[PDB]
Amino acid sequence: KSPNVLLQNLCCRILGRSEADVAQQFQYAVRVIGSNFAPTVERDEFLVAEKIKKELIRQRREADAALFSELHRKLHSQGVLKNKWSILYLLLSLSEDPRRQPSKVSS
Amino acid sequence: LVSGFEATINKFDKNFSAHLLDLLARLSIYSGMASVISRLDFNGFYTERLERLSAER
Amino acid sequence: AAAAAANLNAVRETMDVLLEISRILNTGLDMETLSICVRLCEQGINPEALSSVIKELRKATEALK
Amino acid sequence: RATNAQFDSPEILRRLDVRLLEVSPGDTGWDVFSLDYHVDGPIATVFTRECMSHYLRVFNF
């Protein structure tokens, strides 16, 4: 679909606020994305994968550093995503540290 | 005077301080050799007159 | 059809894998938001910009809370 | 230099150097501080990298 309504879908996913209920936030999203729209990073998933491993080692979720080794091959195996480096660089930036806690559910 | 002395001294002082901070930054990446910056700032004066302004994308 | 559902199968796999990655990394985004992020990544998008947008919108859900 | 360990051999004082561990939001500095007791030479065969990786978990604990 068109990217303008997609940037609107982001701001109504995060907030409970419409494009009319706030107009500054949705204006600010168009301000930030549309000046540097195309990525400045190229395909370097390998380096960021070895930091996701290293991040799950620091939390002692050491089975999930080896579960991610299956998942990172699965992500390339499907191949329906245009940039595989971007989404991992996004999820790694939003990471948090409990203190050393290991919590598991799924799979 | 105040325009044949003072304005030129002010201009010199600005350029010398700005370039000095740029040198001390452009040398700190290189790796000892940072002991010149250590010895030069023995009081702790002029140890933060510039840091690079950060931005993403 | 079937080949139109096999691609629906091959997209349902990667949206489950990225969900597993989202929960073991303890991010804020859920399954529904992740699809907006994946569509943006089909368009071609800078993560250094997208992360600042997500850290701007969430700041105004911690100010209007 | 402050404590009484400057009379030690020069080799072991070289083998230590701290290694940082990667930053995350909400990560405090006590969790990311670990010595690295790196070694090269023929003496590396007894003290391999896998051994050092298992020592750092002890040091962290």
mmCIF file of C-alpha atoms in Angstrom:
data_model
loop_
_atom_site.group_PDB
_atom_site.id
_atom_site.type_symbol
_atom_site.label_atom_id
_atom_site.label_comp_id
_atom_site.label_asym_id
_atom_site.label_seq_id
_atom_site.Cartn_x
_atom_site.Cartn_y
_atom_site.Cartn_z
ATOM 1 C CA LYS A 1 0.000 0.000 0.000
ATOM 2 C CA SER A 2 0.901 3.690 -0.127
ATOM 3 C CA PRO A 3 3.533 4.820 2.424
ATOM 4 C CA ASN A 4 1.610 7.855 3.710
ATOM 5 C CA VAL A 5 -1.288 5.798 5.070
ATOM 6 C CA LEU A 6 1.307 3.317 6.374
ATOM 7 C CA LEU A 7 2.977 6.079 8.400
ATOM 8 C CA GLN A 8 -0.547 6.862 9.637
ATOM 9 C CA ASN A 9 -1.093 3.196 10.603
ATOM 10 C CA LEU A 10 2.057 3.385 12.749
ATOM 11 C CA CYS A 11 0.837 6.439 14.688
ATOM 12 C CA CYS A 12 -2.583 4.888 15.281
ATOM 13 C CA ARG A 13 -0.988 1.608 16.371
ATOM 14 C CA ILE A 14 1.220 3.235 19.021
ATOM 15 C CA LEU A 15 -1.307 5.752 20.316
ATOM 16 C CA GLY A 16 -5.054 5.597 20.742
ATOM 17 C CA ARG A 17 -5.109 8.848 18.814
ATOM 18 C CA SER A 18 -6.338 9.500 15.268
ATOM 19 C CA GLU A 19 -4.906 11.722 12.540
ATOM 20 C CA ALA A 20 -7.480 14.345 13.586
ATOM 21 C CA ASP A 21 -7.258 13.868 17.367
ATOM 22 C CA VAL A 22 -3.571 14.719 17.107
ATOM 23 C CA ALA A 23 -2.122 16.310 14.006
ATOM 24 C CA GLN A 24 1.352 17.247 15.289
ATOM 25 C CA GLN A 25 2.605 13.704 15.961
ATOM 26 C CA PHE A 26 1.543 12.413 12.548
ATOM 27 C CA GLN A 27 3.079 15.543 11.038
ATOM 28 C CA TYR A 28 6.284 14.830 12.960
ATOM 29 C CA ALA A 29 6.425 11.265 11.611
ATOM 30 C CA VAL A 30 6.258 12.566 8.030
ATOM 31 C CA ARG A 31 8.883 15.142 9.069
ATOM 32 C CA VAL A 32 11.364 12.498 10.222
ATOM 33 C CA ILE A 33 10.868 9.665 7.708
ATOM 34 C CA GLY A 34 10.566 11.745 4.566
ATOM 35 C CA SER A 35 13.943 13.394 4.467
ATOM 36 C CA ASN A 36 16.040 10.229 4.819
ATOM 37 C CA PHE A 37 13.460 7.695 3.621
ATOM 38 C CA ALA A 38 15.761 5.166 1.939
ATOM 39 C CA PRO A 39 18.102 3.214 4.287
ATOM 40 C CA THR A 40 21.701 4.263 4.930
ATOM 41 C CA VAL A 41 22.607 0.754 6.116
ATOM 42 C CA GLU A 42 23.318 -2.039 3.639
ATOM 43 C CA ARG A 43 23.150 -5.810 4.129
ATOM 44 C CA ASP A 44 25.168 -6.559 7.310
ATOM 45 C CA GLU A 45 22.822 -8.882 9.315
ATOM 46 C CA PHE A 46 25.809 -11.030 10.316
ATOM 47 C CA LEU A 47 27.374 -8.486 12.686
ATOM 48 C CA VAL A 48 24.041 -7.649 14.315
ATOM 49 C CA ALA A 49 23.214 -11.365 14.698
ATOM 50 C CA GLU A 50 26.435 -11.870 16.625
ATOM 51 C CA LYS A 51 25.311 -9.032 18.907
ATOM 52 C CA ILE A 52 21.882 -10.592 19.483
ATOM 53 C CA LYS A 53 23.731 -13.777 20.507
ATOM 54 C CA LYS A 54 25.988 -11.711 22.770
ATOM 55 C CA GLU A 55 22.914 -9.946 24.230
ATOM 56 C CA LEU A 56 21.177 -13.215 25.098
ATOM 57 C CA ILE A 57 24.446 -14.362 26.701
ATOM 58 C CA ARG A 58 24.532 -11.288 28.981
ATOM 59 C CA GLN A 59 21.003 -12.128 30.213
ATOM 60 C CA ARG A 60 21.867 -15.849 30.682
ATOM 61 C CA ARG A 61 19.121 -16.704 28.166
ATOM 62 C CA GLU A 62 21.732 -18.957 26.637
ATOM 63 C CA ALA A 63 19.294 -21.410 25.075
ATOM 64 C CA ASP A 64 17.728 -18.519 23.159
ATOM 65 C CA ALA A 65 21.068 -17.447 21.703
ATOM 66 C CA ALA A 66 21.039 -20.923 20.109
ATOM 67 C CA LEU A 67 17.321 -20.714 19.297
ATOM 68 C CA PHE A 68 17.974 -17.477 17.431
ATOM 69 C CA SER A 69 20.547 -19.373 15.356
ATOM 70 C CA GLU A 70 17.679 -21.448 13.966
ATOM 71 C CA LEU A 71 15.410 -18.413 13.606
ATOM 72 C CA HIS A 72 17.980 -16.318 11.723
ATOM 73 C CA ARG A 73 18.287 -19.066 9.129
ATOM 74 C CA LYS A 74 14.482 -19.333 8.962
ATOM 75 C CA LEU A 75 14.212 -15.576 8.312
ATOM 76 C CA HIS A 76 16.480 -15.934 5.281
ATOM 77 C CA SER A 77 14.718 -19.178 4.325
ATOM 78 C CA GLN A 78 11.325 -17.559 3.755
ATOM 79 C CA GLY A 79 12.757 -14.606 1.844
ATOM 80 C CA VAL A 80 9.613 -12.453 1.693
ATOM 81 C CA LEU A 81 11.223 -9.423 3.391
ATOM 82 C CA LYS A 82 13.106 -6.783 1.403
ATOM 83 C CA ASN A 83 15.634 -5.857 4.140
ATOM 84 C CA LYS A 84 16.608 -8.499 6.694
ATOM 85 C CA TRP A 85 19.195 -6.232 8.363
ATOM 86 C CA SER A 86 16.758 -3.409 9.135
ATOM 87 C CA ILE A 87 14.207 -5.324 11.205
ATOM 88 C CA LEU A 88 16.933 -6.923 13.319
ATOM 89 C CA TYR A 89 18.660 -3.566 13.792
ATOM 90 C CA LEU A 90 15.265 -2.242 14.924
ATOM 91 C CA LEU A 91 14.496 -5.064 17.361
ATOM 92 C CA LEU A 92 18.028 -4.932 18.805
ATOM 93 C CA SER A 93 17.804 -1.172 19.400
ATOM 94 C CA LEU A 94 14.567 -1.640 21.367
ATOM 95 C CA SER A 95 16.107 -4.319 23.596
ATOM 96 C CA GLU A 96 15.927 -4.188 27.388
ATOM 97 C CA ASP A 97 17.887 -5.815 30.216
ATOM 98 C CA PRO A 98 16.010 -7.299 33.217
ATOM 99 C CA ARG A 99 19.069 -7.889 35.340
ATOM 100 C CA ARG A 100 20.096 -11.446 34.430
ATOM 101 C CA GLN A 101 16.605 -12.946 34.184
ATOM 102 C CA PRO A 102 15.661 -15.870 31.925
ATOM 103 C CA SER A 103 11.993 -15.938 30.893
ATOM 104 C CA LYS A 104 10.539 -18.265 28.269
ATOM 105 C CA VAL A 105 7.225 -18.916 26.570
ATOM 106 C CA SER A 106 6.445 -20.413 23.216
ATOM 107 C CA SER A 107 7.517 -22.999 20.670
ATOM 108 C CA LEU B 1 43.537 49.955 18.961
ATOM 109 C CA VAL B 2 40.103 48.414 19.569
ATOM 110 C CA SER B 3 39.709 47.428 15.915
ATOM 111 C CA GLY B 4 43.340 47.145 14.863
ATOM 112 C CA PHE B 5 44.148 45.251 18.035
ATOM 113 C CA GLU B 6 41.112 43.895 19.803
ATOM 114 C CA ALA B 7 38.969 42.531 16.958
ATOM 115 C CA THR B 8 41.910 40.712 15.387
ATOM 116 C CA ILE B 9 42.921 39.235 18.770
ATOM 117 C CA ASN B 10 39.334 38.032 19.238
ATOM 118 C CA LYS B 11 39.335 36.406 15.783
ATOM 119 C CA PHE B 12 42.700 34.711 16.470
ATOM 120 C CA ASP B 13 41.500 33.468 19.864
ATOM 121 C CA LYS B 14 38.364 31.920 18.344
ATOM 122 C CA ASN B 15 40.197 30.150 15.514
ATOM 123 C CA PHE B 16 42.969 28.874 17.795
ATOM 124 C CA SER B 17 40.575 27.460 20.407
ATOM 125 C CA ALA B 18 38.306 25.811 17.807
ATOM 126 C CA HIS B 19 41.212 24.243 15.951
ATOM 127 C CA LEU B 20 42.842 23.134 19.222
ATOM 128 C CA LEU B 21 39.709 21.240 20.230
ATOM 129 C CA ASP B 22 39.478 19.730 16.730
ATOM 130 C CA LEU B 23 43.109 18.556 16.998
ATOM 131 C CA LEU B 24 42.620 17.044 20.449
ATOM 132 C CA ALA B 25 39.564 15.195 19.122
ATOM 133 C CA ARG B 26 41.189 14.022 15.858
ATOM 134 C CA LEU B 27 44.180 12.702 17.829
ATOM 135 C CA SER B 28 42.115 10.891 20.485
ATOM 136 C CA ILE B 29 40.869 8.397 17.881
ATOM 137 C CA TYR B 30 44.463 7.360 17.166
ATOM 138 C CA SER B 31 45.915 4.671 19.420
ATOM 139 C CA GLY B 32 51.116 6.783 24.851
ATOM 140 C CA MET B 33 50.097 9.427 22.345
ATOM 141 C CA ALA B 34 47.075 10.602 24.385
ATOM 142 C CA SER B 35 49.452 11.506 27.225
ATOM 143 C CA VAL B 36 49.941 14.892 25.507
ATOM 144 C CA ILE B 37 46.269 15.654 26.156
ATOM 145 C CA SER B 38 46.638 14.227 29.678
ATOM 146 C CA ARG B 39 49.648 16.405 30.510
ATOM 147 C CA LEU B 40 48.209 19.514 28.832
ATOM 148 C CA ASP B 41 45.031 19.360 30.949
ATOM 149 C CA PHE B 42 46.552 18.997 34.418
ATOM 150 C CA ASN B 43 44.079 21.423 36.037
ATOM 151 C CA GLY B 44 41.031 20.096 34.198
ATOM 152 C CA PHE B 45 40.572 23.332 32.217
ATOM 153 C CA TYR B 46 39.691 23.213 28.490
ATOM 154 C CA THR B 47 38.854 19.508 28.845
ATOM 155 C CA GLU B 48 35.328 20.033 27.524
ATOM 156 C CA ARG B 49 35.022 22.981 25.167
ATOM 157 C CA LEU B 50 33.680 20.881 22.275
ATOM 158 C CA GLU B 51 32.077 17.530 21.662
ATOM 159 C CA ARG B 52 30.507 16.496 18.362
ATOM 160 C CA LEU B 53 26.770 17.112 18.109
ATOM 161 C CA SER B 54 24.901 13.837 17.743
ATOM 162 C CA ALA B 55 22.118 13.001 15.297
ATOM 163 C CA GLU B 56 20.580 9.918 13.691
ATOM 164 C CA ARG B 57 19.746 9.594 9.965
ATOM 165 C CA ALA C 1 -6.195 -20.914 -4.446
ATOM 166 C CA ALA C 2 -3.506 -23.223 -3.070
ATOM 167 C CA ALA C 3 -0.470 -21.339 -4.402
ATOM 168 C CA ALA C 4 -2.135 -18.146 -3.159
ATOM 169 C CA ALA C 5 -2.450 -19.832 0.252
ATOM 170 C CA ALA C 6 1.089 -21.242 0.171
ATOM 171 C CA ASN C 7 2.402 -17.671 0.043
ATOM 172 C CA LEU C 8 -0.043 -16.910 2.877
ATOM 173 C CA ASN C 9 1.690 -19.808 4.655
ATOM 174 C CA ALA C 10 5.189 -18.536 3.819
ATOM 175 C CA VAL C 11 4.337 -15.079 5.194
ATOM 176 C CA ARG C 12 2.693 -16.534 8.329
ATOM 177 C CA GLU C 13 5.989 -18.265 9.119
ATOM 178 C CA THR C 14 8.194 -15.154 9.121
ATOM 179 C CA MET C 15 5.638 -13.158 11.124
ATOM 180 C CA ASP C 16 5.836 -15.908 13.761
ATOM 181 C CA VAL C 17 9.648 -15.960 13.732
ATOM 182 C CA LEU C 18 9.884 -12.183 14.147
ATOM 183 C CA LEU C 19 7.358 -12.498 16.983
ATOM 184 C CA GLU C 20 9.578 -15.046 18.745
ATOM 185 C CA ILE C 21 12.510 -12.657 18.304
ATOM 186 C CA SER C 22 10.382 -9.771 19.631
ATOM 187 C CA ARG C 23 9.517 -11.596 22.809
ATOM 188 C CA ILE C 24 12.960 -12.987 23.665
ATOM 189 C CA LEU C 25 14.460 -9.514 23.200
ATOM 190 C CA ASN C 26 11.694 -7.904 25.322
ATOM 191 C CA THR C 27 10.761 -5.088 22.985
ATOM 192 C CA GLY C 28 7.615 -2.975 23.272
ATOM 193 C CA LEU C 29 6.164 -3.815 19.870
ATOM 194 C CA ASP C 30 3.483 -6.523 19.516
ATOM 195 C CA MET C 31 2.384 -8.723 16.588
ATOM 196 C CA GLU C 32 0.170 -6.055 15.031
ATOM 197 C CA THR C 33 2.733 -3.217 15.109
ATOM 198 C CA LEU C 34 5.393 -5.579 13.727
ATOM 199 C CA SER C 35 3.392 -5.921 10.499
ATOM 200 C CA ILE C 36 3.463 -2.137 10.019
ATOM 201 C CA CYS C 37 7.231 -2.252 10.539
ATOM 202 C CA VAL C 38 7.581 -5.134 8.057
ATOM 203 C CA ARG C 39 5.545 -3.278 5.395
ATOM 204 C CA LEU C 40 7.767 -0.224 5.909
ATOM 205 C CA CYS C 41 10.773 -2.491 5.444
ATOM 206 C CA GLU C 42 9.253 -3.570 2.127
ATOM 207 C CA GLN C 43 9.196 0.106 1.153
ATOM 208 C CA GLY C 44 12.844 0.547 2.152
ATOM 209 C CA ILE C 45 13.330 2.449 5.392
ATOM 210 C CA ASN C 46 16.210 3.652 7.575
ATOM 211 C CA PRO C 47 16.152 2.041 11.054
ATOM 212 C CA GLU C 48 17.900 5.157 12.454
ATOM 213 C CA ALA C 49 14.809 7.148 11.418
ATOM 214 C CA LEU C 50 12.181 4.504 12.226
ATOM 215 C CA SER C 51 13.519 4.040 15.762
ATOM 216 C CA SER C 52 13.382 7.783 16.452
ATOM 217 C CA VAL C 53 9.772 7.824 15.214
ATOM 218 C CA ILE C 54 8.841 4.901 17.487
ATOM 219 C CA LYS C 55 10.646 6.583 20.399
ATOM 220 C CA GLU C 56 8.722 9.796 19.645
ATOM 221 C CA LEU C 57 5.223 8.286 19.430
ATOM 222 C CA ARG C 58 5.709 6.270 22.611
ATOM 223 C CA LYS C 59 6.934 9.351 24.474
ATOM 224 C CA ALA C 60 3.489 10.883 23.867
ATOM 225 C CA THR C 61 1.795 7.759 25.252
ATOM 226 C CA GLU C 62 3.795 8.332 28.440
ATOM 227 C CA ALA C 63 2.790 12.013 28.550
ATOM 228 C CA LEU C 64 -0.939 11.607 27.807
ATOM 229 C CA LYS C 65 -1.292 8.455 29.948
ATOM 230 C CA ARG D 1 49.439 1.216 41.716
ATOM 231 C CA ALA D 2 47.245 2.155 44.695
ATOM 232 C CA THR D 3 47.107 -1.330 46.217
ATOM 233 C CA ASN D 4 50.129 -3.540 46.912
ATOM 234 C CA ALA D 5 50.220 -5.365 43.592
ATOM 235 C CA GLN D 6 52.880 -3.345 41.728
ATOM 236 C CA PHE D 7 55.563 -5.786 42.890
ATOM 237 C CA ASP D 8 54.058 -8.499 40.690
ATOM 238 C CA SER D 9 55.706 -9.809 37.547
ATOM 239 C CA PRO D 10 55.414 -7.575 34.453
ATOM 240 C CA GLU D 11 53.858 -10.366 32.367
ATOM 241 C CA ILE D 12 50.681 -10.906 34.381
ATOM 242 C CA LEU D 13 50.143 -7.148 34.608
ATOM 243 C CA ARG D 14 50.084 -7.139 30.809
ATOM 244 C CA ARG D 15 47.802 -10.185 30.477
ATOM 245 C CA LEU D 16 44.942 -8.401 32.208
ATOM 246 C CA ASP D 17 42.966 -5.679 30.430
ATOM 247 C CA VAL D 18 39.261 -4.953 30.937
ATOM 248 C CA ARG D 19 36.739 -5.796 28.237
ATOM 249 C CA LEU D 20 33.525 -3.821 27.891
ATOM 250 C CA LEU D 21 30.287 -5.648 27.268
ATOM 251 C CA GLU D 22 27.666 -4.161 24.898
ATOM 252 C CA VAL D 23 25.191 -1.495 26.022
ATOM 253 C CA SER D 24 21.409 -1.896 26.101
ATOM 254 C CA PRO D 25 18.754 0.479 27.474
ATOM 255 C CA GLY D 26 18.292 -0.110 31.187
ATOM 256 C CA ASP D 27 21.628 -1.924 31.505
ATOM 257 C CA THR D 28 23.664 -0.855 34.528
ATOM 258 C CA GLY D 29 27.435 -0.702 34.553
ATOM 259 C CA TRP D 30 28.052 -3.359 37.219
ATOM 260 C CA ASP D 31 26.673 -5.987 34.845
ATOM 261 C CA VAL D 32 28.997 -4.841 32.071
ATOM 262 C CA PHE D 33 32.524 -4.957 33.475
ATOM 263 C CA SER D 34 34.754 -7.977 33.024
ATOM 264 C CA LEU D 35 38.490 -8.513 33.013
ATOM 265 C CA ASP D 36 40.108 -10.106 29.981
ATOM 266 C CA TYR D 37 43.213 -12.095 30.918
ATOM 267 C CA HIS D 38 44.299 -12.546 27.276
ATOM 268 C CA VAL D 39 47.333 -14.622 26.380
ATOM 269 C CA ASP D 40 49.392 -15.352 23.291
ATOM 270 C CA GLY D 41 52.413 -17.594 23.034
ATOM 271 C CA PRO D 42 52.984 -21.294 23.656
ATOM 272 C CA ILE D 43 51.311 -20.815 27.056
ATOM 273 C CA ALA D 44 47.985 -20.191 25.289
ATOM 274 C CA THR D 45 47.504 -23.930 24.678
ATOM 275 C CA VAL D 46 46.761 -24.621 28.342
ATOM 276 C CA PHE D 47 44.650 -21.456 28.813
ATOM 277 C CA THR D 48 42.511 -21.376 25.683
ATOM 278 C CA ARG D 49 39.766 -18.905 24.747
ATOM 279 C CA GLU D 50 36.994 -21.304 25.807
ATOM 280 C CA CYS D 51 38.589 -21.449 29.262
ATOM 281 C CA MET D 52 38.632 -17.639 29.497
ATOM 282 C CA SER D 53 34.979 -17.523 28.428
ATOM 283 C CA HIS D 54 34.146 -19.879 31.260
ATOM 284 C CA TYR D 55 36.227 -17.877 33.777
ATOM 285 C CA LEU D 56 34.337 -14.681 32.989
ATOM 286 C CA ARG D 57 31.026 -16.247 34.055
ATOM 287 C CA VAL D 58 32.639 -16.989 37.428
ATOM 288 C CA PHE D 59 34.004 -13.461 37.624
ATOM 289 C CA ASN D 60 30.569 -12.058 36.773
ATOM 290 C CA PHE D 61 28.909 -14.215 39.435
#
